[PDB]
Design a protein around this ligand. Sequence first.
Ligand SMILES: Cc1cc2nc3c(=O)[nH]c(=O)nc-3n(C[C@H](O)[C@H](O)[C@H](O)COP(=O)(O)OP(=O)(O)OC[C@H]3O[C@@H](n4cnc5c(N)ncnc54)[C@H](O)[C@@H]3O)c2cc1C
Ligand SMILES: Cc1cc2nc3c(=O)[nH]c(=O)nc-3n(C[C@H](O)[C@H](O)[C@H](O)COP(=O)(O)OP(=O)(O)OC[C@H]3O[C@@H](n4cnc5c(N)ncnc54)[C@H](O)[C@@H]3O)c2cc1C
Ligand SMILES: Cc1cc2nc3c(=O)[nH]c(=O)nc-3n(C[C@H](O)[C@H](O)[C@H](O)COP(=O)(O)OP(=O)(O)OC[C@H]3O[C@@H](n4cnc5c(N)ncnc54)[C@H](O)[C@@H]3O)c2cc1C
Ligand SMILES: Cc1cc2nc3c(=O)[nH]c(=O)nc-3n(C[C@H](O)[C@H](O)[C@H](O)COP(=O)(O)OP(=O)(O)OC[C@H]3O[C@@H](n4cnc5c(N)ncnc54)[C@H](O)[C@@H]3O)c2cc1C
Ligand SMILES: O=c1ccn([C@H]2C[C@H](O)[C@@H](COP(=O)(O)O)O2)c(=O)[nH]1
Ligand SMILES: O=c1ccn([C@H]2C[C@H](O)[C@@H](COP(=O)(O)O)O2)c(=O)[nH]1
Ligand SMILES: O=c1ccn([C@H]2C[C@H](O)[C@@H](COP(=O)(O)O)O2)c(=O)[nH]1
Ligand SMILES: O=c1ccn([C@H]2C[C@H](O)[C@@H](COP(=O)(O)O)O2)c(=O)[nH]1
Lengths: 216, 210, 216, 220
Amino acid sequence: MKIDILDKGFVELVDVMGNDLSAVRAARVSFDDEERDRHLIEYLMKHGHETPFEHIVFTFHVKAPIFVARQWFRHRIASYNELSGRYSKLSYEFYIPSPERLEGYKTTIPPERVTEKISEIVDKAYRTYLELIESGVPREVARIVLPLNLYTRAFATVNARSLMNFLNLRADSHAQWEIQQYALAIARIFKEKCPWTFEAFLKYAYKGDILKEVQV
Amino acid sequence: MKIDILDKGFVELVDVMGNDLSAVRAARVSFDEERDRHLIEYLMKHGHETPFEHIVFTFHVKAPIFVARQWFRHRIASYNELSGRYSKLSYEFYIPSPERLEGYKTTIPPERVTEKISEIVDKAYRTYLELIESGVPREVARIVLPLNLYTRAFATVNARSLMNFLNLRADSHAQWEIQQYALAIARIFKEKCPWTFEAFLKYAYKGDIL
Amino acid sequence: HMKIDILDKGFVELVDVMGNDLSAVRAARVSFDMGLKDEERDRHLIEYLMKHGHETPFEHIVFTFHVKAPIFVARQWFRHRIASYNELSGRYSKLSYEFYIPSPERLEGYKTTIPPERVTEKISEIVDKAYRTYLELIESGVPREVARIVLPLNLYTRAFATVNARSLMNFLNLRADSHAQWEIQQYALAIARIFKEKCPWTFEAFLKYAYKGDIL
Amino acid sequence: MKIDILDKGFVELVDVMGNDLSAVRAARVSFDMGLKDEERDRHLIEYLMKHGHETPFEHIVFTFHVKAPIFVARQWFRHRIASYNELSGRYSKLSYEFYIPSPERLEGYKTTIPPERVTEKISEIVDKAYRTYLELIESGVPREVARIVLPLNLYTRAFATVNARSLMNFLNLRADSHAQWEIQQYALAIARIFKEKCPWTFEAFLKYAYKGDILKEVQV
Ligand SMILES: Cc1cc2nc3c(=O)[nH]c(=O)nc-3n(C[C@H](O)[C@H](O)[C@H](O)COP(=O)(O)OP(=O)(O)OC[C@H]3O[C@@H](n4cnc5c(N)ncnc54)[C@H](O)[C@@H]3O)c2cc1C
Ligand SMILES: Cc1cc2nc3c(=O)[nH]c(=O)nc-3n(C[C@H](O)[C@H](O)[C@H](O)COP(=O)(O)OP(=O)(O)OC[C@H]3O[C@@H](n4cnc5c(N)ncnc54)[C@H](O)[C@@H]3O)c2cc1C
Ligand SMILES: Cc1cc2nc3c(=O)[nH]c(=O)nc-3n(C[C@H](O)[C@H](O)[C@H](O)COP(=O)(O)OP(=O)(O)OC[C@H]3O[C@@H](n4cnc5c(N)ncnc54)[C@H](O)[C@@H]3O)c2cc1C
Ligand SMILES: Cc1cc2nc3c(=O)[nH]c(=O)nc-3n(C[C@H](O)[C@H](O)[C@H](O)COP(=O)(O)OP(=O)(O)OC[C@H]3O[C@@H](n4cnc5c(N)ncnc54)[C@H](O)[C@@H]3O)c2cc1C
Ligand SMILES: O=c1ccn([C@H]2C[C@H](O)[C@@H](COP(=O)(O)O)O2)c(=O)[nH]1
Ligand SMILES: O=c1ccn([C@H]2C[C@H](O)[C@@H](COP(=O)(O)O)O2)c(=O)[nH]1
Ligand SMILES: O=c1ccn([C@H]2C[C@H](O)[C@@H](COP(=O)(O)O)O2)c(=O)[nH]1
Ligand SMILES: O=c1ccn([C@H]2C[C@H](O)[C@@H](COP(=O)(O)O)O2)c(=O)[nH]1
């Protein structure tokens, strides 16, 4: 299960422990009834009893630009392992906005030129980086010229409670657009694996705007 | 997978996400046994603990309250416990064996200590029942139940925090009763993540009993 | 320096505090590249943050409390994980003869076949018998960690609790509420009152825009 | 106290709650005791640190104001047991401020072009990137997009509230040769303020608990 985001990004589901019933079992404290189980999901969610959802956990492999990643990693109730720029020589991959991204703003140049200007500095910066590498500058110093739209990759392990908080904050029109796109992809996977929690979430607890407008 | 502890306790495995290779993927960030075990042993000797956060367990635990109060002090974890405010509580209490007092020289036989603990349990629970029956709400009436009352909780914990738990509780400074629970967590941990557990013991484990 | 007595023998005492309402104003304003301004503008900002659920800034206000409470209240309380605790150890201390004996008024609303005073009395009896067994086992050489297991949940414990304002507001949402047990609500009202004294602007805003409970 | 780091960075102490005795006090509640004596209390600290009792140190808390290159901020903010508020490039027009390494930053590395050329080549892309950034803003491009061309050595600012235990974990990990040299420098300043505010805790830490290398060789 892998969803493309932006121009070269993606959200990929690596693993999952549990399903809707894991939250139910934890709430009841019972190891071993659709309508009743689902009623309980709804009740916990409606009255703010969120601890049982911590028993559902996801691992994602995410590929995203550093400026998105830095917003993402502010979410502390989660586990992250990221590609190190200190030790790995970095790939020529950068997020270059679509002209589509600026259509809607009154600019004094065509958005094609915005794109071309962004692409131009990315190219010079990267070339400078490679010159420094070849000349023997250690990577951890050479990379500091790389712009914030460099794509990085991370594994993120997070429980459903923390994922829902993530959704309230990032699946929302006040969040930067680029991260909204990643949150839609998190939402899709979450919906597929925990359909009851997800619907109860949207109905009772979700505080954002986009997921009630935009299917899955 | 279920391991009985003390007189009426247990630890069972409810679910697990991942295995030794979940740490290996994370540390490499992508997606040969001897290379991969070597990476596990390398992370462990150098204190690179974050990759082990991606293996997660859920256990179902039956434990007396005084053990559970020490256990729940481990904050990097998720718990749901049965509510005494709402469940009529079950005539289940930890009564030590006589062997629990080995090494101690006591005024009365260990067998009389045992008997005295169970007398109190009996009189406490009966007072509790007296109060329920007379219309005292449960949340009030159970305040007289002793600290050896058995409780049950689900516990979800990643392998890093599980290793910290074992460092502190699978050790002879912990109270013996919680050591016994820690031994069981260790045994389940070993079954599910052998390379990680083996490297843990050899390189990072700080306790003595394991 | 603040001390509030709760129940028959408990208390909540403020030991120390870091920061004040302006500590959250300061933390927030760094976002816009700004700092402190005037009384009207900073007040308005604190209200703004609370309405919109920008809670991170309030993490920069921290309290240390010294609390005396029955073990059944302390157990509920220590479930709040985003905090730091150090408690009295039944493994190493000779425990004192102090137990919460509910007053007869605690039973108001409930028709009991035993009058209230006699309930109070039965609770005293059972507690006294437990403590005497406890003492007798200690005196006879039973290790303290073992002898204490006969002591009832209404035994008083003591603890230091360090908690930031954000996590404190979360504690107030859950415990300063009529769905919480009467005994912990009384502790929550003490906590709220100290919070009020020390962070009047944050507290007023919390109450108006974010507080989810009923009793405050 | 404000300590300058790198060419333009700093660590400044905004606030502190508690001191060494805050930990002695929290620790003494286990044994039904309070504060006992101004040399028994120093021994209690050493003792706690010697046997791995870390929780008492949670009751000392610091708030720091830090200015640091993004690449450093990103490493720092990986410490989850802490509270952070950072200057936002979504909502602010960022200032012309970048970490340009000194020529001495490349001591002990054989290079092919001299260290002043390296230093120059970094400035060049920084000046090109900032101009572009300003051109994009001038043209009506929103800040949250324009800033994506700015390099990792752009300076940012944050508040960090952190307890002494977490701060001691930070020091284990960042006041250490394995950590990137730039964040080492930040960890030294943090060490310095911690020592000035909590000398007993700090000395006990270096002696019994600290796992890094640098703070045993580098004074303060
Ligand atoms: C033999 C022994 C006797 C003890 N006696 C006492 C006693 O007298 N009094 C008492 O109160 N408790 C005592 N305990 C409890 C002990 O101090 C801890 O509460 C418990 O072991 C949890 O440890 P922890 O904080 O490492 O685990 P967790 O709470 O699970 O946290 C795990 C890790 O995360 C980090 N962490 C999490 N939260 C914070 C935070 N807020 N600040 C900084 N770092 C954080 C730490 O690095 C920690 O190692 C005792 C434990 C044992 C084994
Ligand atoms: C009226 C009521 C009845 C209840 N009955 C039960 C019961 O029957 N059984 C039972 O076990 N408990 C019950 N509780 C306890 C309850 O489940 C919580 O433990 C308690 O309210 C602590 O809340 P918290 O987790 O939000 O606070 P903390 O644990 O401090 O967490 C604060 C916030 O941090 C976040 N957080 C912290 N850690 C994690 C994590 N690991 N994953 C995701 N998010 C995290 C959450 O956003 C949370 O709101 C009851 C509580 C109340 C108020
Ligand atoms: C020299 C070195 C090189 C590194 N290179 C890499 C790299 O290649 N890739 C990469 O992604 N990062 C790397 N880092 C970052 C590292 O993986 C950690 O995220 C960071 O150092 C914070 O460490 P911490 O988890 O101890 O701190 P915090 O996240 O503040 O946690 C502090 C303590 O709390 C406990 N704790 C907190 N949260 C959890 C949790 N969710 N589960 C279990 N225990 C918890 C632990 O006991 C820990 O000791 C590097 C760090 C250094 C120092
Ligand atoms: C539109 C928007 C703009 C923002 N702009 C800014 C900016 O200008 N500057 C900036 O620095 N950041 C900003 N952020 C980041 C934001 O401040 C949070 O750090 C981020 O949203 C993560 O939120 P969280 O703390 O709820 O998540 P997590 O850190 O995963 O915490 C999850 C839950 O745990 C609890 N919790 C966890 N740790 C603690 C703790 N140490 N103390 C108390 N409670 C805790 C809380 O209940 C919280 O809901 C922005 C976020 C968004 C969505
Ligand atoms: O929408 C936002 C705005 C800010 N931040 C956090 C991430 C960084 O730590 C810091 C600056 O983010 P930018 O404004 O530079 O994206 O605040 C977010 O997480 N989300
Ligand atoms: O010494 C290091 C190396 C990496 N990281 C973390 C920070 C980022 O989230 C990610 C990659 O950092 P760089 O290696 O790119 O600096 O891992 C550190 O915290 N410290
Ligand atoms: O109102 C409640 C009920 C339960 N619990 C938690 C605390 C204990 O860890 C466990 C059992 O609480 P009692 O219902 O037994 O009080 O569930 C609470 O925090 N509050
Ligand atoms: O070995 C211990 C001793 C104490 N505590 C914590 C749990 C309680 O919150 C408090 C007192 O526990 P007892 O000493 O009463 O078991 O300190 C532990 O976690 N482990």
